[PDB]
């Protein structure tokens, strides 16, 4: 009578002894990246900026972020077996991606050392797979360092927490408990992974669904712009900006047709696979849309201010695609960027509002190039690219000096969660209490004061470490003074 029971549908964890094992674990790593780098995870840092005001529909879900409710935001979110959401869910998903990328990279290195691949094509493919795993490690560590480490401009912090990074774990070890690393070690690790993985990847792209050298260049330019090195950002952004052309449209209908299609968009450098049965998700946090027969009806819990509406000219193509005048069916504007893709519907004339995950586009590369050109004093390449981008999107800008860049970057990257980082590094306070709401939405979108004023250099622009860490790890130096 032997009694040992092995699960049905679960396989044991072995070192890689063939090439098919390496390819299967790499595809599992990409499917893990799809559920991490979502638009649904970057809505919190988008709502925390100074663009949005809560409506009367909101059931205290987004209102801790808009109104800066620091009593909730200290231990917001949860990551357990029925829900991964919030600040804690953000901190959990990128650590999970970092750990499984570590396991894949270390097992592929040991398989290349033990020579379990037959011919040389498998060794070349395994080395390219290793480069892709290193890029995913660098993306996970940078996206954790962005939200949980301080800037150089913060005034009051915890005692000894201004020059600290995050917990850096370089090997697969699920029982490690250690202290936070210094910021120099973390940024040297990120830039070392990117510079070591650029040299192995081929120049031309093999597929839009997997990591290429263009994504490593674009990620390195984004990291160098977030650091403060403008010459290196302009150096890395030039290798990719002349490979992906902008959208060619005549009116806003063709722009909405080409933009919302994940397959026919010529600007995406990197995106995850999606179909109507695998890899699609619903992103109705900002617009609140719900299908009704064959129409879409909206009920948002947050709408933009009046200056965000006044940013876009009336001839802009983005004034009916990125934001849309659909609140109260004709009266006000919402952020309609992640509405839908029409290829992921069940029945081809009924909306279900399912989108896919995009990881990097070419418009951000254009904006990084113009910013690094205006900050290092090379004005002709700053007036060429910004006027090309603004003309391709419908409304051409006239004067190019550092105030059209801020407005164009606010116009282009709305909804993606890159305004809080800007208003930290451009030294902008909130002024949520001084902005005017929309005059058409009176009774629906009213004002609510901030529960905590956030001046230039406030500590709460950087999130606090979760409560499961710094309870299980008493060696951890926390962030906030409170």
């Amino acid at each position: 009578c032997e009694l040992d029971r092995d699960p049905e549908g679960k396989d044991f964890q072995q070192p890689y002894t063939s090439f098919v094992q390496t390819k299967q674990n790499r595809d599992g790593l990409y499917a893990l990246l799809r559920n991490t780098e979502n638009p649904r995870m970057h809505f919190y840092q988008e709502l925390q900026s100074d663009m949005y005001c809560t409506t009367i529909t909101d059931g205290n879900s987004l209102a801790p972020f808009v109104n800066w409710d620091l009593g909730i935001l200290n231990d917001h979110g949860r990551a357990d077996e029925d829900e991964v959401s919030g600040i804690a869910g953000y901190y959990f998903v990128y650590n999970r991606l970092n750990q499984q990328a570590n396991a894949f990279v270390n097992n592929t290195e040991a398989a290349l050392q033990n020579q379990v691949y037959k011919n040389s094509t498998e060794i070349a493919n395994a080395k390219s797979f290793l480069a892709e795993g290193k890029v995913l490690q660098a993306l996970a560590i940078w996206r954790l360092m962005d939200r949980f480490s301080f800037h150089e401009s913060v005034t009051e912090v915890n005692s000894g927490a201004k020059d600290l990074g995050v917990i850096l774990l370089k090997e697969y070890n699920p029982g490690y408990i250690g202290p936070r690393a210094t910021k120099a070690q973390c940024y040297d690790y990120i830039l070392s992974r990117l510079s070591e993985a650029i040299e192995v990847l081929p120049e031309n792209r093999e597929s839009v669904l997997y990591v290429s050298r263009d994504y490593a260049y674009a990620l390195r330019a984004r990291i160098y712009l977030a650091l403060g090195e403008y010459g290196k950002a302009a150096a890395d952004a030039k290798m990719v900006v002349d490979k992906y052309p902008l959208i060619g449209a005549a009116d806003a209908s063709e722009f909405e047709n080409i933009y919302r299609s994940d397959a026919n968009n010529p600007e995406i450098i990197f995106r995850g696979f999606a179909s109507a049965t695998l890899g699609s998700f619903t992103a109705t946090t900002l617009n609140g849309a719900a299908p009704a027969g064959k129409d879409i009806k909206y009920n948002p819990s947050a709408v933009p201010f009046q200056w965000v509406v006044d940013l876009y000219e009336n001839e802009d193509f983005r004034k009916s695609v990125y934001i849309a005048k659909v609140v109260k069916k004709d009266k006000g504007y919402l952020v309609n960027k992640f509405l839908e893709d029409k290829a992921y519907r069940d029945v081809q004339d009924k909306p279900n509002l399912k989108v896919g995950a995009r990881y990097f586009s070419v418009a951000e590369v254009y904006l990084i190039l113009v910013e690094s050109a205006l900050q290092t004093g090379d004005t002709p390449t700053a007036e060429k690219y910004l006027k090309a981008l603004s003309k391709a999107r419908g409304a051409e800008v006239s004067v190019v000096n550092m105030e059209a860049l801020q407005a164009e970057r606010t116009r282009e990257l709305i909804g993606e969660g890159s305004r809080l980082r800007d208003m930290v590094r451009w030294s902008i306070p909130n002024n949520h209490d001084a902005f005017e709401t929309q005059p058409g939405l009176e009774g629906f979108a009213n004002t609510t004061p901030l529960k905590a004023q956030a001046p230039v250099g406030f500590y709460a622009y950087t999130w606090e470490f979760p409560q499961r860490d710094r309870q299980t790890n008493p060696q951890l130096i926390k962030n906030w003074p409170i």
Partner: protein
């Protein structure tokens, strides 16, 4: 069944009488010392939470071992058994009593035992019937809520609707000029203003009538008991039907059958078979516990009273209206008839034994049991619904099969050596096995009501992937106990057990447990001539026991599928793995004393226990940097210490009268001893509790001081710091360093109960009370109904009108724009005293049945369950909870009249 030196509490059949619930453990709340039973829903398909001698672990389950006639079952299978078939219920709360049953015998076992036929020359027939109703038991929480226009004035003054707006400008054209919504639907564009007023600012809509109702309950039963010279039988059939008290449907309905049979074949072999079956229908209200807008007790408390779910004639409409919505919200009967659900479960328990007595002394006994249940459920989403998001319909079918087999074989040999040295040996073998299975298949895209098979849906992007789950486990055990007894006054019990489980790794699955116990009859040796005392036995024990209830595959390092494209497959890392996982070992010391006076007329029992748990299975919370939520591990240890005592009497006076009473009490003190990572303390995040060394799992909160009378802000005490005048220092800025461990407990320390019963010539009246003190709960509903910061769209408490302004300054409730925290002002005293049942019966006199030999017995009842509770908890129910009171299903208050014809 159990030793003589053990701790056994036997509950008789009269306390397992007609109870109009399917949850039988709730009939034992307050009848056993130490065993505390708490249920958390008035749902008919709800299962009680039993704990004997406090909580024994932190990660593994502390439920007992439920055994019905030798083979061990679960409480959902026990819920399909007719409770009128049960003869008694023994609770074995000892380490020497629970030494032949082991899977989680450290938590105690519950031995349910079924009725057998008495051996009279004429058989017995019994026909029982009953009928009752069930209502909600508390209404006091909605006695201090705002009205409609009062809430509208409070919202307009606080700046929720506008910055410069009046009451009429809001109530006229903002949320009553929303006939624009009802004018889009053909079914109700001509009913607005004529027979359907969704927004009514002149009355107050009774939202308790729109969400809770009065529900009927029926049961019937017929039983034939008999027995001839060697054989005995008990056959029974019956049915039970309970409806849900809430308007969101959750019923329970079963048709049962039972045949116990015993026979003596010859002078050498005795065989028997006790086998039962059931056909059952369940449904659960799966929205209680979550905070949706118009559902549950949160919906009866927080929905604004100017939204009307009724029509002009008083009936419940199909839809109502909330301002800002883009489709009408469906009420609970319409949502119940547009989303059908139906379950059907077939359960069979087959169980048999054979005793062989070859020589004088030893008896061999073989026993085998099979437990099969096939469940089959169906769900729909009906097409052509105007208030839905699509005109297409969906369907989903599921098939469950759970099969559990068991075999057990003992060989007992009892003998004496000279005259007064009776030994008894027993060796035995036990094998338990289980294999479950779930299959599911859905379809969608239907356009007609009649054409709704699963093979008739769309075939493109409207397809989906099926469901499949498999679970299985096994247990193997070898046990042996020896009883030695002297002439009358000395009994010594010694037992060894080897347990092997399938849930642990191949080098760690086997464990050895033992127990030694003793009983001394002081009355039959020393004080055999006495005037008042009539019994005195002293007893003590010590044994170690295991606990292995974690999950089936918690020790492998596993890899699962995670597909990226639709061309190749993809693997991800699923769990972390722990190769060194093994049992959790609990050693319990026990020491008792059982007296007796006035020859049966005063019984008293006093017990003492320790129950130390080592190598405790904790589902330890890994840090988030590892990429895993949690992992089971053998780390930590936690002590108990308790006293429990019971006493029953008889204080009757005359020949006609018969008055008796009973009392029952238990206190214990938990203590954690070692956590997991070298940690001194660990606070569970956003639960409010903390695990610390040397204390129970207490509450971990900030302390609320009051408000600031000069500026209106909330105030919290600074922990540790004292001002110069002796008063404690306050602060008005909240932080997580203001939290400290407060001297409460999540598990209540003191439980008990007491019963009274009077009788007369036929007419009898029994009343049972249960109580729990020391219980505190976080009232999470008061976060929503007592805040002026956020969620202003909901109904609020009436106290948010004396809020601190510049004119109104002498008050107690804070200023408006502040969010409350979870601190000690949301921690409430949920200590209650209930009146569990109040049964009044009247057995008809025997002189009425004189000539007719067709009848010969009749009884009637008038039973009331939960009709009285005294507590100071303001949240619809103090028992329905545990660490928080969320949007909860309150318990029921039930009135039941029955009849019994025994003939």
């Amino acid at each position: 069944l159990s030793t003589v030196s053990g701790s056994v509490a036997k509950v008789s059949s009269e306390k397992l009488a007609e109870k109009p619930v399917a949850n039988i453990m709730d009939a034992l709340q307050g009848q056993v010392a130490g065993m505390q039973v708490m249920t958390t829903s008035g749902d008919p398909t709800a299962v009680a939470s039993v704990e004997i001698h406090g909580t024994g672990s932190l990660g593994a389950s502390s439920a007992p071992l439920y055994i019905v006639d030798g083979m061990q079952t679960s409480l959902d299978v026990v819920a399909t058994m007719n409770p009128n078939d049960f003869e008694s219920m023994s609770v074995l709360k000892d380490a020497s009593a629970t030494s032949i049953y082991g899977a989680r015998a450290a938590n105690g076992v519950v031995f349910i035992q079924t009725k057998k036929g008495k051996m009279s020359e004429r058989g017995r027939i019994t026909f029982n019937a009953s009928y009752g109703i069930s209502q909600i038991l508390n209404t006091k929480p909605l006695d201090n809520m705002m009205t409609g226009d009062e809430l509208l004035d409070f919202q307009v003054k606080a700046g929720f609707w506008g910055n410069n707006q009046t009451v009429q400008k809001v109530k006229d054209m903002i949320l009553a000029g929303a006939e624009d919504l009802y004018g889009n639907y053909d079914s109700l564009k001509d009913e607005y203003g004529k027979t359907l007023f969704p927004v009514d600012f002149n009355h107050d809509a009774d939202w308790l009538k729109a969400l809770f109702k009065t529900a009927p309950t029926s049961q019937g039963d017929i039983s034939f008991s008999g027995g001839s010279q060697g054989t005995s039988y008990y056959a029974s059939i019956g049915y039970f039907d309970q409806e849900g008290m809430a308007r969101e449907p959750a019923n329970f309905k079963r048709y049962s059958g039972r045949l116990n049979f015993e026979s003596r074949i010859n002078e050498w072999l005795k065989v028997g078979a006790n086998l039962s079956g059931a056909i059952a229908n369940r449904r659960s209200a799966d929205y209680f516990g979550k905070y949706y807008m118009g559902s549950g007790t949160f919906g009866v408390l927080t929905m604004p009273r100017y939204y009307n779910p009724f029509d002009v004639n008083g009936d419940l409409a199909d839809v109502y209206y909330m301002y800002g919505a883009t489709r009408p919200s469906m009420t609970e009967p319409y949502f119940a008839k547009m989303r059908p659900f139906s379950s059907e479960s077939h359960q069979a328990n087959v169980n048999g034994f054979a005793q062989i007595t070859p020589i004088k002394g030893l008896t061999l006994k073989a026993q085998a049991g099979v437990d099969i249940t096939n469940t089959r459920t169906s769900s729909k989403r009906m097409p052509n619904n105007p208030y839905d998001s699509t005109p297409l319909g969906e369907r989903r079918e599921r098939a469950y099969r759970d099969v559990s087999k068991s075999f057990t074989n003992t060989a007992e040999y009892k003998f004496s050596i000279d005259e007064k040295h009776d030994l008894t040996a027993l060796m035995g073998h036990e094998y338990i096995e289980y294999e479950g299975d779930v299959i599911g298949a859905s379809s969608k895209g239907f356009e007609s009501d009649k054409l709704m098979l699963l093979s008739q849906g769309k075939t493109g992007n409207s397809l989906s992937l099926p469901e499949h789950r498999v679970a299985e486990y096994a247990y193997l055990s070898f046990f042996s106990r020896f009883n030695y007894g002297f002439d009358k006054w000395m009994y010594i019990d010694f037992s060894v057990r080897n347990d092997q489980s399938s849930r642990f790794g191949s080098n760690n699955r086997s464990a050895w447990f033992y127990s030694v116990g003793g009983m001394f009859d002081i009355y039959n040796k020393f004080i055999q001539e006495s005037n008042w005392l009539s019994d005195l036995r002293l007893k003590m024990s010590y044994g170690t026991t295991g606990n292995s209830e974690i999950g089936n595959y918690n020790h492998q390092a596993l890899v699962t599928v995670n597909n990226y494209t639709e061309d190749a497959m993809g693997l991800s890392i699923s769990t972390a793995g722990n190769p060194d996982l093994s049992w959790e070992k609990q050693s319990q010391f026990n020491f008792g004393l059982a007296a007796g006076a006035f020859n049966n007329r005063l019984s008293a029992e006093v017990d003492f226990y320790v129950r130390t748990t080592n190598d405790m299975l904790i589902d330890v919370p890994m840090p988030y940097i590892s990429g895993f939520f949690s992992q089971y591990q053998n780390v930590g240890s936690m002590k108990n210490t308790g006293v429990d005592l019971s006493l029953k009497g008889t204080i009757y006076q005359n020949k006609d009268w018969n008055v008796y009473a009973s009392a029952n009490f238990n206190y214990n003190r938990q203590e954690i001893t070692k956590l997991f990572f070298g940690l001194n303390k660990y606070m569970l995040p956003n639960t409010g509790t903390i695990w610390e060394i040397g204390y129970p799992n207490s509450f971990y909160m900030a302390e609320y001081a009051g408000i600031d009378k000069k500026t209106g802000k909330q105030l919290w005490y600074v922990p540790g710091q004292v001002d110069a005048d002796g008063n404690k220092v306050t602060t008005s800025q909240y932080s997580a360093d203001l939290e400290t461990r407060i001297d409460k407990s999540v598990t209540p320390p003191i439980t008990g109960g007491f019963s009274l019963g009077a009788s007369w010539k036929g007419l009898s009246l029994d009343a049972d009370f249960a109580y729990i003190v020391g219980k505190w709960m976080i009232n999470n509903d008061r976060y929503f109904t007592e805040n002026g910061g956020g969620l202003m769209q909901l109904n609020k408490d009436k106290m948010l009108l004396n809020a601190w302004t510049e004119d109104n300054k002498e008050t107690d409730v804070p200023k408006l724009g502040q969010s409350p925290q979870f601190d000690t002002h949301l921690l409430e005293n949920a200590s209650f005293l209930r009146l569990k049942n109040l049964k009044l019966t009247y057995v008809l006199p025997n002189s009425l049945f004189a000539g007719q030999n067709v009848i010969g017995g009749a009884r009637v009842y008038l039973m009331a369950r939960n009709l009285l509770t005294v507590t100071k908890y303001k949240g619809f129910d103090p028992e329905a909870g545990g660490n928080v009171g969320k949007n909860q299903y309150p318990n029921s208050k039930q009135y039941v009249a029955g009849i019994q014809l025994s003939f």
